[PDB]
């Protein structure tokens, strides 16, 4: 009670809790004690302070709803660092990609705020009413400019005043750790989106060559297997931790009656979800395979357009040379030579794609077998729930 009574003095209120009747009671008690009840009332003194502890707590729960919206910001942070609603982040990550392919410079910060402010306007027509956009900024690291640029960008929930009593230094320092794996989970989801559209854009224009018919067909089968296995893994591991933790905190903050039980409900919340996402001291057997599948989908991606662009540009020279055959009649042996050179270059690129596919499906076969054994070695926590889900995905 004595810790909560001091927290309602610096809340821009000097009001004794919810009434001026908390003065009345003290005066009554002091006269009663003065003439009556000389022996201490240790059985009854603990009763009406508990009938004081309950009223000072809910009034302190009432001053947030009028001025600051404390636990409304508990829900609002889940939409950005925990990525609850995807349309805020997908219309972000669409515009955010043409800046992340290039390495970061000293002129990297001034434009992302313009990219942020045009992304929050394109998805909203009523979100200008709350105070969320002023308490949410972009956080970058001190990494040297010789990187890939993708790992620098991250959003942070800012605090200034009475939002910073419930949010200490220890909370958002863990929220960047849970952001970087979840940003990389959506990074893999959108670069696989680009190569799936790369499957369907290139196959429509190379129609006319019978050799490249069966070339892309079996390669689309071996690409679809890395698509369907990543999808039923990555969609299910982050929706489940979303499920057991949204329904853990949000339903108990309005059933308990304290401000110190809000944080006591909160300080157990924000370290359960990151322990199921990425970070434990025993979870070194978790993030070693999820980074081994992370660079494998990069290696599968850059090799595709290294062999698609060979398979697609060399066809473009064949079709313009067909146009020169009708113009020479309206206006020979060397023309047949260069045709035989193109076919030899068509013949070169297909085993080069076959060799650069049969060695990467051997890597994926080695990843999918090592992904099982490393996730079955931890020290008797809720891994029986985690060892449950990955056997269900590969077989069913």
């Amino acid at each position: 009670i004595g810790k909560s009574i001091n927290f309602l003095h610096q809340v821009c209120h000097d009001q004794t809790p919810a009434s001026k009747a908390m003065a009345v009671g003290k005066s009554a008690e002091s006269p009663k004690d003065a003439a009556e009840l000389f022996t201490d009332l240790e059985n009854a003194f603990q009763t009406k302070i508990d009938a004081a502890y309950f009223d000072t707590s809910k009034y302190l729960l009432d001053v947030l709803n009028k001025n600051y919206n404390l636990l409304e910001h508990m829900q609002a942070m889940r939409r950005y660092l925990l990525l609850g609603q995807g349309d805020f982040i997908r219309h972000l990550m669409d515009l955010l990609k043409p800046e992340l392919v290039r390495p970061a410079t000293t002129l990297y910060q001034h434009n992302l705020t313009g990219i942020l402010e045009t992304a929050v306007r394109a998805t909203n027509a009523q979100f200008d009413n709350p105070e969320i956009l002023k308490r949410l900024d972009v956080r970058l690291l001190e990494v040297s400019p010789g990187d890939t640029g993708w790992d620098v960008f991250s959003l942070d929930y800012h605090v200034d005043g009475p939002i910073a009593t419930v949010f200490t230094r220890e909370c958002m320092s863990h929220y960047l750790r849970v952001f970087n794996f979840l940003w990389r989970a959506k990074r893999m989801e959108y670069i696989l989106t680009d190569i799936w559209k790369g499957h369907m854009c290139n196959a429509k224009l190379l129609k006319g060559m019978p050799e490249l018919s069966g070339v892309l067909h079996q390669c689309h089968i071996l690409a679809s297997e890395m698509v369907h296995f990543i999808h039923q893994m990555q969609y299910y591991i982050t929706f489940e931790v979303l499920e057991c933790s949204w329904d853990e905190l949000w339903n108990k903050v309005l059933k308990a009656q304290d401000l110190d039980h809000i944080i006591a409900a909160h300080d157990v919340f924000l370290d359960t979800i990151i322990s199921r996402c990425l970070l434990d001291s025993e979870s070194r057997a978790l993030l070693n395979q999820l980074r081994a599948v992370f660079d494998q989908i990069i290696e599968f991606q850059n090799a595709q357009d290294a062999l698609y662009r060979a398979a697609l540009e060399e066809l473009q020279q064949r079709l313009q040379f067909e146009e020169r055959k009708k113009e020479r009649e309206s206006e020979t042996a060397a023309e047949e030579d260069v045709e035989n050179k193109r076919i030899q270059e068509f013949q070169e690129s297909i085993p080069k794609m076959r060799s650069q596919l049969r060695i990467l499906t051997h890597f994926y076969q080695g990843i999918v077998q090592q992904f099982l054994v490393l996730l079955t070695t931890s020290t008797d926590e809720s891994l029986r729930f985690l060892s449950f889900r990955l056997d269900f995905n590969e077989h069913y």
Binding site: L83, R90, T193, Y235, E243, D247, N393
Partner: protein, 436 residues
């Protein structure tokens, strides 16, 4: 951002898209001529993904409607939902067409109105600087939707190469062949364009419509006024991750990417159970999610005429199970727990399978926030039975000397009939080869 342009075309494609836009106003809480409810922004968090973005809070539909027959559009302007449509985006008053009933009519009319057909439909393309793609809301029945729809599947493949193409096309009826007889010819000509000149389709059978239209709907005389009720709900059901705020596969290139195994194998089986209004009086007792997906894989809600004894040698590869509205998500992993024990889906022996389940909150409305809804997007390899049904009705007609002299007078000089036959058998052979 994620703007899709719907290409409503044909005699049947215009009517199934007319109530598709009429369904969208009842769930967005908006009127076609005004905004009388405040439920449009607090309840629905995203509205500018199929509509055009607002200038006066008037969400214009991003729709174009061309047809040779003026009868389908003259039953539109007297309805009070046509003022939401614009008389300058597609046509003004008194628009017409051909005479006209031929596949070669609309196939030859595409290059004589070539200047005007690529002028006003491209004005909506540069409205958003990141276009999603094109959906051809056309028909296969008749020569109106099949004749002109095969032309735009070719010229939009190279002029817009980086855009998603995927159609909700309806299959024609094969009960008798008296009123129409040109049905095997115009269907297979468009079906070739749906596999190599198009990425994905969504099949909608006509003989499976009256299987459902007399199942629970209890009609005696089958009319055309019931064909828009099963179709318009599952169209808006397919964009619940896209219209309403979802997280995963919230784009149209999200859903189709996780189901297609390979090109020319894209024919997706559709299922949708809840269509009865007297179920409403017993959904007050917490009807759960544990019983709604046990009947999706059970062949009862399917809209595809397929064999019943041909499912033992065929295998599911991708199955989608979309729950909407009230889900009670603490037991949605419990519903997926019971899938492996029955093995109602035959799994491919060469690779893994996937049962993907997703959810999104529905409209703030009383028939929507109370009753559970299940949308199925299956992919089973028994779909060659329809391709065996259409091909056996195709080669039998060419031996009867039917429409070989009556069809090659206009713009057909060589026999392109076996060009459609081998490519259809290429689809039918690669389906059975796909499970090694």
């Amino acid at each position: 951002p994620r703007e899709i342009i719907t290409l409503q075309l044909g005699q049947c494609g215009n009517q199934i898209g007319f109530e598709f836009w009429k369904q969208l106003c009842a769930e967005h809480g908006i009127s076609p001529e005004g905004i009388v409810e405040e439920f449009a922004t607090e309840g629905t968090d995203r509205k500018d993904v199929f509509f055009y973005q607002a200038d006066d809070e008037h969400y214009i539909p991003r729709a174009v409607l061309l047809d040779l027959e003026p009868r389908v559009i003259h039953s539109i302007l007297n309805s009070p939902y046509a003022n939401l449509y614009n008389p300058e985006n597609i046509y003004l008053s008194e628009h017409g067409g051909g005479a006209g009933n031929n596949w070669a009519s609309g196939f030859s009319q595409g290059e004589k109105i070539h200047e005007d057909i690529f002028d006003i439909i491209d004005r909506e393309a540069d409205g958003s600087d990141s276009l999603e793609g094109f959906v051809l809301c056309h028909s296969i029945a008749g020569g109106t939707g099949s004749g002109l729809g095969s032309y735009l599947l070719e010229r939009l493949n190279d002029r817009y190469p980086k855009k998603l193409v995927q159609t909700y096309s309806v299959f024609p009826n094969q009960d008798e062949m008296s009123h129409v007889v040109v049905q095997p010819y115009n269907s297979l000509l468009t079906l070739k364009r749906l596999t190599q000149n198009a990425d994905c389709v969504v099949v909608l059978d006509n003989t499976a419509l009256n299987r459902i239209a007399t199942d629970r709907l209890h009609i005696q005389n089958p009319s055309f006024s019931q064909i828009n009720q099963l179709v318009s709900t599952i169209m808006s059901a397919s964009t619940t991750t896209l219209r309403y705020p979802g997280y995963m596969n919230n784009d149209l290139i999200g859903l189709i990417a996780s189901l297609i195994p390979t090109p020319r194998l894209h024919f997706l089986m559709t299922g949708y159970t809840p269509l009865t209004t007297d179920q409403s009086v017993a959904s007050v007792r917490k009807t759960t999610v544990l019983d709604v997906m046990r009947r999706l894989l059970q062949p009862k809600n399917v809209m595809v005429s397929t064999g019943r004894d041909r499912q033992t040698n065929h295998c599911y590869i991708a199955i989608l199970n979309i729950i909407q509205g009230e889900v009670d998500p603490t037991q949605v992993h419990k519903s997926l727990q019971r899938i492996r024990e029955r093995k109602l889906a035959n799994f491919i022996p060469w690779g893994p399978a996937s049962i993907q389940v997703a959810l999104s909150r529905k409209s703030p409305y009383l028939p929507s926030a109370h009753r559970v809804s299940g949308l199925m997007m299956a992919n089973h390899t028994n779909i060659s039975s329809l391709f065996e049904r259409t091909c056996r009705q195709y080669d039998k007609l060419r031996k009867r000397e039917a429409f070989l002299e009556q069809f090659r007078k206009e713009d057909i000089f060589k026999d392109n009939f076996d060009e459609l036959d081998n490519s259809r058998e290429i689809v039918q052979q690669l389906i059975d080869e796909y499970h090694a």
